Amino acid sequence: AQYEDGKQYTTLEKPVAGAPQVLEFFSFFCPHCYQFEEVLHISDNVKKKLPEGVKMTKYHVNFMGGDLGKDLTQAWAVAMALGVEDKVTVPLFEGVQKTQTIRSASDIRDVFINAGIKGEEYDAAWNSFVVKSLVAQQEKAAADVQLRGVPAMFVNGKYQLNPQGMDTSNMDVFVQQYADTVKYLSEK
Numbered sequence: 001a002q003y004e005d006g007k008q009y010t011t012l013e014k015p016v017a018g019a020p021q022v023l024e025f026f027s028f029f030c031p032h033c034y035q036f037e038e039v040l041h042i043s044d045n046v047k048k049k050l051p052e053g054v055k056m057t058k059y060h061v062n063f064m065g066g067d068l069g070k071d072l073t074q075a076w077a078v079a080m081a082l083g084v085e086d087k088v089t090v091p092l093f094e095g096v097q098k099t100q101t102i103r104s105a106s107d108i109r110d111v112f113i114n115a116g117i118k119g120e121e122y123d124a125a126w127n128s129f130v131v132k133s134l135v136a137q138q139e140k141a142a143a144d145v146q147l148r149g150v151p152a153m154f155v156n157g158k159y160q161l162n163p164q165g166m167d168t169s170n171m172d173v174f175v176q177q178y179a180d181t182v183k184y185l186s187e188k
Contacts, residue, residue, distance in 0.1 A: 007165040008181040012158055016144045019157025020057035022050065022182060023141060025150050028072045028096040029064035036151045038093050040171060045179040046153075054186050058085070059138040061150055071105040072096070077134035078112070078125040087115040155185035 005011055024043060026033040036042045047056050060076035062069050075092070079085050091111045095102035102108055112122045125131055141147075145154050153161040166177045 003181060003184050007162065008177065009155075009159045009162050009165070009185060012145065012154070012160060014146075016141075016154075016157030019141070019144065019154065021054045021156055022046065022056040022186065023145075023154045023157075024056070024058040025061050025142060025145075025147055025152045026058065027061050027064040027069065027150050028076075028092050028102075029069060030150045031097065033151045034093050034097050037089065040175050042151070042153075042175060042178055045175050046182045049179045049183045051183070051186055059141055061142055061147065062139065064150070068103070068105075068108075071108055073138055074126065074131065074135055075105075075108045075112075077131045077138065078122060080134055081125050081128070081131055082117065082121070084112070084115065084117060087117075088112060091115065153182065155182060155188075159185045159188070161185075 003009070024046075026037065043056065043058060050056060060073040062073050065072070072092070075088075079088050088111055091114070092102070092108070095107065095111055102111070109119075109122055109126075113119055144157070145152070145160070155161070161178065161181060163174070163178060166174055166181070168174055
């Protein structure tokens with residue numbers, strides 16, 4: 001058929017109960033993740049095609065970059081808690097991978113300050129248990145899909161996007177196929 005198990009997507013041997021409808025994993029340290037977000041705009045192309053009432057969730061992962069990796073997962077938690085994902089995503093990617101001016105937790109924080117988040121506001125979120133639990137969910141979700149690598153995307157805790165089973169020649173066609181596959185999986 002057009003969409004086939006083992007081609008555009010695979011099926012989790014062990015489905016995750018209560019998982020987000022569309023779940024993306026990434027790291028600000030991840031070069032393929034930079035491509036996905038900053039050049040391909042995979043997240044945004046996926047959301048533009050999701051059925052009505054399908055929320056898209058994006059989590060950060062710890063296993064890249066050691067101590068700063070964890071700082072970045074915690075900062076992403078802050079971004080989620082404050083709802084400023086669309087203000088900090090581009091400068092966090094560029095700060096980690098393009099300019100490499102992000103070397104410490106303080107440097108991460110600078111990104112938020114610059115984006116207009118008040119220091120008091122960032123610090124209170126950073127030290128909050130609401131943010132600790134958000135870090136815990138992100139780590140749990142990764143465990144639940146037995147996550148091996150990033151970028152990755154899962155639909156209804158049942159299906160894992162398989163970009164390797166899609167075309168790479170045109171970026172745009174690749175991105176469309178990816179977005180089109182997520183929508184198919186969401187309605188499945």
